[PDB]
Amino acid sequence: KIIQQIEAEQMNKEIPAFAPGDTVIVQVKVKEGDRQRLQAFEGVVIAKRNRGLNSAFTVRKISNGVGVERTFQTYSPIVDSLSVKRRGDVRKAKLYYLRALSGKAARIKEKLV
Amino acid sequence: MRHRKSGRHLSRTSAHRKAMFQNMAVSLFEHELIKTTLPKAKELRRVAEPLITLAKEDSVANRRLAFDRTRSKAAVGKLFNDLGKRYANRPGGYLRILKCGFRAGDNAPMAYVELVDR
Amino acid sequence: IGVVGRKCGMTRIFTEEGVSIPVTVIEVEPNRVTQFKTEETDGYRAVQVTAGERRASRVTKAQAGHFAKANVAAGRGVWEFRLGEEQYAAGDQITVDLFQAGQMVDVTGESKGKGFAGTIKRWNFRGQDNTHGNSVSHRVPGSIGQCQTPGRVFKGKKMSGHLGAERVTVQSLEIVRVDAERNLLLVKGAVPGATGGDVIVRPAAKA
Amino acid sequence: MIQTQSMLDVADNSGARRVMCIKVLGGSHRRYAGIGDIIKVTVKEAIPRGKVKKGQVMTAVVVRTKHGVRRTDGSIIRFDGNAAVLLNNKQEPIGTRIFGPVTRELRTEKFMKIVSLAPE
Amino acid sequence: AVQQNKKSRSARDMRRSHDALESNALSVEKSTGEVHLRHHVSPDGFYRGRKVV
RNA sequence: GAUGUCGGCUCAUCACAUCCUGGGGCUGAAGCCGGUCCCAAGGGUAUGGCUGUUCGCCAUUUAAAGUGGUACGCGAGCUGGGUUUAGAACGUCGUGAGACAGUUCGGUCCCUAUCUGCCGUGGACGUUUGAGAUUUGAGAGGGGCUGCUCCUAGUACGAGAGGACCGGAGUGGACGAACCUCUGGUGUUCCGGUUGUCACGCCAGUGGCAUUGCCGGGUAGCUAUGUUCGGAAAAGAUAACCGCUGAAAGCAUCUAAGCGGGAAACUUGCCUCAAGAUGAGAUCUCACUGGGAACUUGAUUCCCCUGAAGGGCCGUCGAAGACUACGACGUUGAUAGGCUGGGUGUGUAAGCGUUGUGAGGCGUUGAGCUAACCAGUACUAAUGGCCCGUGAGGCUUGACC
RNA sequence: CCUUGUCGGGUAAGUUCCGACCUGCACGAAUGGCGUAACGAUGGCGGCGCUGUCUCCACCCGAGACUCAGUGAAAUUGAA
RNA sequence: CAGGUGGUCGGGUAGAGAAUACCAAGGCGCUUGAGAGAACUCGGGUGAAGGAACUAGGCAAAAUGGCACCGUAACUUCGG
RNA sequence: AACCCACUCCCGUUGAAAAGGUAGGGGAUGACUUGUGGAUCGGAGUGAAAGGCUAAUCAAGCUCGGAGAUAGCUGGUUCUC
Ligand SMILES: [Mg+2]
Ligand SMILES: [Mg+2]
Ligand SMILES: [Mg+2]
Ligand SMILES: [Mg+2]
Ligand SMILES: [Mg+2]
Ligand SMILES: [Mg+2]
Ligand SMILES: [Mg+2]
Ligand SMILES: [Mg+2]
Ligand SMILES: [Mg+2]
Ligand SMILES: [Mg+2]
Ligand SMILES: [Mg+2]
Ligand SMILES: [Mg+2]
Ligand SMILES: [Mg+2]
Ligand SMILES: [Mg+2]
Ligand SMILES: [Mg+2]
Ligand SMILES: [Mg+2]
Ligand SMILES: [Mg+2]
Ligand SMILES: [Mg+2]
Ligand SMILES: [Mg+2]
Ligand SMILES: [Mg+2]
Ligand SMILES: [Mg+2]
Ligand SMILES: [Mg+2]
Ligand SMILES: [Mg+2]
Ligand SMILES: [Mg+2]
Ligand SMILES: [Mg+2]
Ligand SMILES: [Mg+2]
Ligand SMILES: [Mg+2]
Ligand SMILES: [Mg+2]
Ligand SMILES: [Mg+2]
Ligand SMILES: [Mg+2]
Ligand SMILES: [Mg+2]
Ligand SMILES: [Mg+2]
């Protein structure tokens, strides 16, 4: 229980409650050119691990006609903010069936209001 | 390589092995003493006791969960009515294993499996 | 000198700026001193050092009387460290207090043993084909020697067997944190062996 | 792209549509090429009129891949599609407008041109 | 493959010198005075002085 | 009374007449580059197109894509494209069967390793009384590579173009060892979805077989395509070469005497094994203090009492393992299974109640199930037994009451 | 034969392939000469899809190999 | 002794079907077993990023596959 | 698809088998496949022709006689001085 007890002290609260199938917006830090600033990265969440400090989610954005996905570490001092803009029912845990579909086929349904 | 892995194969396929331990348990809850083989008794004690722990709570959902893994009317009837009530206040450790000699034909070491209060 | 610990699993800590430091956590029992080998009865100069909690019914009377020349009441293992020059008494106490930040150290230990390994895993050989006419030989070694002269296999040929649990030392790993309350060292990098093993932490001399 | 004979398209206006890797420049035998490395391409399928003819040895830098780029964190950016940007004899680009996103991992002193020309 | 010379009486008997037997884990039952194997049920059915079968 | 022939794959080892890196002499060597010759074998020494090809010719690299020996290394290690038995065909030669050191299509590659050898791993005995544990290191292996920038400095050099030596800092490639926190993979023992059919008396619910029926996910372990670390610095003795003093030979002269500088090679330095190192080493600690007779006198042999320190069998097991061996533990008890709480995974179980003519939806509703993980707990299994090992450790000499 | 003859096409690069040239060592007209739609388990090149063929292998499931009890061969051999 | 041997009978649910998947009547468990879960060999399952770079040669594996309708080239012996 | 045949890979080679097996292949209303009964024979038959088949034997079977064929060719040839 000695690494299960160090890992309580790195965790200081940064994140709200959410699920796969949401549309989050993420404020990340940008360290370039000797000036720190923020940057907004908004997409749809497709994955979650829950190992403690080793928790990490994944969010897919369609930027300028090109897909991109970004895996964020949860308790990093880079992932600053996390807001939830929409939520819906998907009845699965990992949405990896959206690396193929593109447009109207990749619509998250709405049972959940 | 087997590092920290658990469960032994016994040189049977995975569907034989499921349908054999289901059949050694269903005969143990009729006669309450079985003369069996020693490596087959060390792995019977990881199948039988989750049926005795389950029998301590009567439910329609538990009598369906019990029927769906030891599939017999007589074994479900022998639980929930005799067992799970005789063992109502013993936490764990429901049956014992006593090594007994060797088989005549081969040398397969034997064992008894016996319920603990009988 | 050095301190004897235990591998207790890998973790990961974050700095202020944002990078991740992979960290191996090492638990240290405070180490008692058993002997102090001087140079006039023994030649060399060294120190026996002992970690604790062995049951009383497992020590022989040869070892129980050996652990009572100094009031130690000792446990598992006796290790010995060769040292340049420092005085030590018979019954002393060696803690994690001689380490600081930075301070690149050496870490020894037994590795994890794989049973009886072939030549594609032990020595990283290459394989023959899989479809183009090939016979039973798909992962076997190739040839061994030359034909008529020398007529025998040279000593030191690379063949199969026992990727060992032999001793190995990782070299020049740096210390991230010293904890004199829960008795921890935090080392950035990999430490040899399985979790729950036994390990030695020595200040490095390669530098 | 990341291996010899890896079809990958270009992210450029004046270029072709598809090219193919033939040699990973660098060391003795670099087997793979990540984001921000110089490869050497042949032009495999041109646009009916651009600038670059079909079947010409050129030089390109790699800007997007499906394997991803990894930072000093457990945080990786991973696209879907491979993408290159052609160069001249000197390492300046040929075209004018770059299509799609790039990463900020690429920006060094010699590559301050194409980072400014792209919508990230 | 085959041999090229036959093996003598010496080099045949040296091979089978690592091949002996043992089963000495015997025990006397305290109650019945019956001999059996250590950590086994006695051939009458007693284990540590208790009838089980 | 048989030594299986060319090229490829796999695995290699030596030579030096050096391709690269290291040290230097001369130059028709300004600088950057070179040319040529002495010293040096430590580590390196390309992917492809075409051909049966080695070879070669090309395209693109690179610090460089060295030359030879080992049955032109290697078929009881692989292949069988070439040569190549029987079939068929073209061109040529012979009236004819047929042939060609000319072409073209098709054509079975055998072996369970006894000995030397090698890579792993145990048994027996020895080390002069016997045990438990820790070690010195005689000797032997492992490793050894290199680019590009940037500062020195656009300085020395040169009409200009072009541009350094010595030193320092940075981060790449190829190779190696370890290791799963991360990023992934696998995960037929975990949880879902679903197709055909048989069954449990029927409806519901569920279970067999269909490659794990076909798939979606995935804990532990294992793993690389991931993560970290490595190659040195320095010291000695030298090679080529550069000398300093200095005669023989009044001068000169690196040598005859004397005195230095000198490279990845050599010897240490760093990691591992290592007293079977028969030369069998060294420290600490523990154990055992009974007779008798025969016959011969390191006195030997027998009889009887005694069996210690300890070890082994046996049992529960292990990130140890082909068997062994090693390591932890046996009621002085957390060694393994179960049980009780977590954690992780999966994605709102059945039953009821509702809405609807019905499939279905909704309270039921983060539900239920959850292998290998963590923490606790004597509930079951590790039996206060047997066998080995004895009884004070020879003799000579010197010191030493 | 000399020979990878010379010229064009296809590939970043083509001793094979396709189209021509005529200098046919040694083509040629029922041992038939040149064309030819459809058919070939036929010979040779090229392309799309596709992939553990391959960079370079990692993991899992069965049957052997290994250990224990029963039975129990073979080729070979001057002597060690 | 995994081979060879002429002719009749031949139910049910799906399906064009004597193919194929489960079952009825009826019959069998293939005359050495028990372990443990090394290399390597055989018969299989999945795979990051590439997609013939392998090789004498896409050999072998992977992929394609049903019924209904739309749609269809050069060429030709006028059928294809 | 039964059925007849034998194009590819791997396994097997002391095989389960003196020519198979597991996966894939070609023909499948005819120059078809096959059951029973007969006819053709050793310099002789048959042959959509390979020198193929004629009882696991074929550029001329198998068996018994001539016949203890012939061998300038190999191998062997036995107690003492
Ligand atoms: Mg869509
Ligand atoms: Mg099945
Ligand atoms: Mg192990
Ligand atoms: Mg094979
Ligand atoms: Mg010799
Ligand atoms: Mg011979
Ligand atoms: Mg030389
Ligand atoms: Mg050869
Ligand atoms: Mg062979
Ligand atoms: Mg050989
Ligand atoms: Mg050296
Ligand atoms: Mg139903
Ligand atoms: Mg059935
Ligand atoms: Mg000793
Ligand atoms: Mg004792
Ligand atoms: Mg005529
Ligand atoms: Mg004709
Ligand atoms: Mg035909
Ligand atoms: Mg046997
Ligand atoms: Mg039917
Ligand atoms: Mg793949
Ligand atoms: Mg893929
Ligand atoms: Mg090749
Ligand atoms: Mg090729
Ligand atoms: Mg094929
Ligand atoms: Mg038939
Ligand atoms: Mg067929
Ligand atoms: Mg047909
Ligand atoms: Mg012929
Ligand atoms: Mg015949
Ligand atoms: Mg005659
Ligand atoms: Mg004769």
Automatic annotation (TrEMBL), chain A:
Keyword Metal-binding part of the UniProt annotation: yes
GO biological process: translation
Record GO cellular component, one term: cytosolic large ribosomal subunit
Keywords: Metal-binding, Ribonucleoprotein, Ribosomal protein
Domain of life, source organism: Bacteria
GO molecular function: structural constituent of ribosome
Residue numbers binding Mg(2+): G103
Family statement drawn from the similarity comment of this UniProt entry: Belongs to the bacterial ribosomal protein bL19 family.
Protein function: This protein is located at the 30S-50S ribosomal subunit interface and may play a role in the structure and function of the aminoacyl-tRNA binding site.
NCBIfam families: rplS_bact
This protein's name: Large ribosomal subunit protein bL19
Species this protein is from: Pseudomonas aeruginosa
Upper lineage: Bacteria, Pseudomonadati, Pseudomonadota, Gammaproteobacteria, Pseudomonadales
UniProt gene name: rplS
UniProtKB/TrEMBL annotation, chain B:
Organism: Pseudomonas aeruginosa
The protein, known as: Large ribosomal subunit protein bL17
Residues the record lists as binding Mg(2+): H3
Gene assigned in the entry: rplQ
NCBIfam families reported in the protein's UniProt record: L17 (TIGR00059)
Family: Belongs to the bacterial ribosomal protein bL17 family.
Pfam families per record: Ribosomal_L17
GO cellular component assignments: cytosolic large ribosomal subunit
Keywords (A to Z) from UniProt: Metal-binding, Ribonucleoprotein, Ribosomal protein
Gene Ontology molecular functions: structural constituent of ribosome
GO terms, biological process: translation
PANTHER family in the cross-refs: LARGE RIBOSOMAL SUBUNIT PROTEIN BL17M (PTHR14413:SF16), RIBOSOMAL PROTEIN L17 (PTHR14413)
Keyword Metal-binding found: yes
Subunit (UniProt): Part of the 50S ribosomal subunit. Contacts protein L32.
Metal-binding is among the record's keywords: yes
PROSITE patterns in UniProt: RIBOSOMAL_L17 (PS01167)
InterPro entries for this protein: Ribosomal_bL17, Ribosomal_bL17_CS, Ribosomal_bL17_sf
UniProtKB/TrEMBL annotation, chain C:
Pfam families for the chain: Ribosomal_L3
Protein's recorded name: Large ribosomal subunit protein uL3
SUPFAM superfamilies, alphabetized: Translation proteins (SSF50447)
One GO MF term attached to the UniProt entry: structural constituent of ribosome
Record's function text: One of the primary rRNA binding proteins, it binds directly near the 3'-end of the 23S rRNA, where it nucleates assembly of the 50S subunit.
Subunit structure: Part of the 50S ribosomal subunit. Forms a cluster with proteins L14 and L19.
PTM sites of type N5-methylglutamine: Q148
A biological process term (GO) from this entry: translation
Organism: Pseudomonas aeruginosa
GO cellular component, one term: cytosolic large ribosomal subunit
Modifications made to the protein after synthesis: Methylated by PrmB.
Positions contributing to Mg(2+) binding: H138
Swiss-Prot/TrEMBL keywords: Metal-binding, Methylation, Ribonucleoprotein, Ribosomal protein, RNA-binding, rRNA-binding
Family: Belongs to the universal ribosomal protein uL3 family.
Keyword hit for Ribosomal protein: yes
Gene3D superfamilies: 3.30.160.810, Translation factors
From TrEMBL, chain E:
GO biological processes: translation
MF terms (GO), sorted A to Z: structural constituent of ribosome
Entry keywords, A to Z: Ribonucleoprotein, Ribosomal protein
The organism's place on the tree of life at top rank: Bacteria
Start and end residues of each stretch annotated as Disordered: 1-53
GO cellular component terms, A-Z: large ribosomal subunit
Biased composition (Basic and acidic residues): 10-21
Pfam family, one: Ribosomal_L32p
HAMAP family given in the database record: Ribosomal_bL32
Family the entry assigns: Belongs to the bacterial ribosomal protein bL32 family.
PANTHER family, per database record: 50S RIBOSOMAL PROTEIN L32 (PTHR35534), LARGE RIBOSOMAL SUBUNIT PROTEIN BL32 (PTHR35534:SF1)
Name under which the protein is recorded: Large ribosomal subunit protein bL32
